[PDB]
Nucleic acid binder design. Structure first.
Lengths: 72, 71
DNA sequence: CCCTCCCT
């Protein structure tokens, strides 16, 4: 059970929270991680990833994949 | 003693109970109304309010303010 | 693109 913080620009975050909140809703329900995204229109936002190794991995990889398809 | 039912989306209602449970704690205590909330992840939830016009009015106003800020 | 918040 480990935690890892990811830094993220404003626009970056919006992608992980696709219109209506589903994008996270997958990543969450699909990796098994505890995912939190500090709110408030702040230029830099933390996304905390919390859980066992593979859960993190999975959440990470989906996060990566989401941003990967946003260039630009 | 009046009963007034409030239809409420699943998102909204989660804000009234905000966190461990304290948001309702606040309103139950500080408004002095009989507040009930239907249970389970149903999209559509009822909040019954029983009491005097005062308590009903208090509770309601406390709800609106929890809602107003989200936003 | 803003997400969940579990109370008698």
């Amino acid at each position: 059970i480990l935690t890892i913080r990811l830094l993220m620009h404003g626009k970056e975050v919006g992608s992980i929270i696709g219109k209506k909140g589903e994008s996270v809703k997958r990543i969450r329900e699909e990796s098994g991680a505890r995912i939190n995204i500090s709110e408030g229109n702040c230029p830099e936002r933390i996304i905390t990833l919390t859980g066992p190794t593979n859960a993190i991995f999975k959440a990470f990889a989906m996060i990566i994949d989401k941003l990967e398809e946003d260039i630009n």
